[PDB]
Design a protein around this ligand. Structure first.
Ligand SMILES: [Hg+2]
Length: 208
């Protein structure tokens, strides 16, 4: 239940260059409107030249673009994933279970989150607000964690192993067949949410 290593490594992998955190929050808030985000829109919000925005994103290897070259994915995405993340009347998606717990606080909006247990396929859902989770169904929902790798693409090294599960026992049974996953751990969705809070606290402190 010692979570500092996860926080530290996730911060290091997310914070590739200066301005990343300054860029990320407004980007998330724009994406949350459910439409592709142009680099010029970001430039305007931030008061940066579009050239600088381009510089930041260049380092964010996993960033998803549409056929128009607009941003459609950076943690929160318009491209379908296993993690549905709805704000108001807009269906968005997230790259992993932990993202769904972290983003509402950064966006400042409540999200309806839904997915399926990675071990059993059972539907899972909850409401995530910037301060708390509610309507956790099933109530014993769990999350898998692994240790992020600093220089690797965050999706292939972290996101793809961070799932929701129907319960802790179910997830632990699943985990027994997943050795070599560095720092693989099962926590309750509540502990994962608390992890997200500490992550956010450290991330926001690095903003201008
Ligand atoms: Hg993720």
């Amino acid at each position: 239940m010692k979570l500092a290593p996860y926080i530290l490594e996730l911060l290091t992998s997310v914070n590739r260059t200066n301005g990343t955190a300054d860029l990320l929050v407004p980007l998330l808030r724009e994406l949350a409107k459910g439409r592709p985000v142009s680099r010029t829109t970001l430039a305007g919000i931030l008061d940066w030249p579009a050239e600088r925005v381009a510089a930041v994103l260049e380092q964010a290897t996993s960033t998803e673009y549409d056929k128009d070259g607009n941003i459609i994915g950076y943690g929160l995405t318009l491209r379908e994933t296993s993690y549905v993340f709805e704000i108001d009347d807009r269906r968005l998606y997230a790259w992993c279970a932990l993202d769904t717990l972290i983003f509402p606080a950064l966006i400042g909006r409540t999200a309806r989150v839904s997915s399926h247990c990675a071990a059993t396929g059972a539907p899972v859902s909850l409401t995530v607000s910037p301060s708390e989770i509610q309507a956790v169904e099933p109530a014993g929902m769990a999350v898998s964690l692994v240790l992020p790798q600093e220089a690797a693409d965050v999706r292939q090294s972290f996101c793809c192993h961070v799932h929701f599960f129907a319960s802790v026992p179910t997830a632990e049974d699943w985990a027994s067949k997943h050795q070599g996953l560095e720092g693989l751990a099962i926590v309750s969705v509540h502990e994962a949410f608390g992890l997200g809070q500490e992550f956010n606290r450290h991330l926001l402190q690095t903003m201008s």
